[PDB]
Write a protein that binds this ligand. Structure first.
Ligand SMILES: CN(CC(=O)Nc1ccc(S(N)(=O)=O)cc1)c1ccccc1
Ligand SMILES: [Zn+2]
Length: 258
């Protein structure tokens, strides 16, 4: 009876196995745009993905991950609110059963159809596993998805999903360029938070872009054909794999823009 997104193992149950679920810096949150403070000391975000080396795509039973070779100084996030250099290890999405829900962060209570998370670890800690044990271990770049025009740079991901329908399937996915998933603007909100899935570790500097990307209805429909269950188990569609907004408690959200 492990954690998931259902009635009996979903977000409201996670605190039993992972008591940090009720902690002081949990994610996601609602971003109250009028209460976020513009911080003119915040630097432009530096996203340097020119040499990113995607290796593989994995259905892990909760989402799918596009994984990267993080053994060298390639695909890194710097600047913005960050001190030092953070290296890209994986990305994944959270999405809904319907276009009206699916994002984890919300903006003035608005839910987007999905949310992309580009996960990076602080190079001062040597690798991902050590970084997650530190309060400044990770930087997650979050990007909202709305349904409209297709995102051409997403299509390579969409097309491989048929080969990883089920928990534990992976496929070679070399040469995927995550620059094709980025909106025009790198204007952002930032706050200190957590992983949004168990173990819910409070190790993340969140950087949430203001500008959503548009994906087509057909693209997101293909996300919804994935399965939470393993092969030869009863079919439970992989939909609504998002954690709701958590209490802000004693945190300030900062805006890079006026
Ligand atoms: C399962 N896992 C690997 C992992 O990448 N976790 C993870 C990475 C990112 C996120 S999210 N949704 O906040 O961007 C959530 C979880 C893990 C991490 C730390 C300790 C133990 C397991
Ligand atoms: Zn995520």
């Amino acid at each position: 009876h492990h954690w998931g997104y259902g009635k009996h193992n979903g977000p409201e149950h996670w605190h039993k196995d992972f008591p940090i679920a009720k902690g002081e810096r949990q994610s996601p949150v609602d971003i109250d745009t009028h209460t976020a403070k513009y911080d003119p000391s915040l630097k432009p975000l530096s996203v340097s993905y020119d040499q990113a080396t995607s290796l593989r795509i994995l259905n892990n039973g909760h989402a799918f991950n596009v994984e990267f070779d993080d053994s060298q100084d390639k695909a890194v996030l710097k600047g913005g609110p960050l001190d030092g250099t953070y290296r890209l290890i994986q990305f994944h999405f959270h999405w809904g059963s319907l276009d009206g829900q699916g994002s984890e962060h919300t903006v003035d209570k608005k839910k987007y159809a999905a949310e992309l998370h580009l996960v990076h670890w602080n190079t001062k800690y040597g690798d991902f596993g050590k970084a997650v044990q530190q309060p400044d271990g990770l930087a997650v770049l979050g990007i909202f998805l709305k349904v409209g025009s297709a995102k051409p740079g997403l299509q390579k991901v969409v097309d491989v999903l048929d080969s990883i329908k089920t928990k534990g399937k992976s496929a070679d996915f070399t040469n995927f360029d995550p620059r094709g998933l980025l909106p025009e603007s790198l204007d952002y909100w930032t706050y200190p938070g957590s992983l949004t899935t168990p173990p819910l570790l409070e190790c993340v500097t969140w950087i949430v872009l203001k500008e959503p990307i548009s994906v087509s209805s057909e693209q997101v429909l293909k996300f919804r054909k994935l399965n939470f269950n393993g092969e030869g188990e009863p079919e439970e569609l992989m939909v609504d794999n998002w954690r709701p907004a958590q209490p802000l408690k004693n945190r300030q959200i900062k805006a890079s823009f006026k």
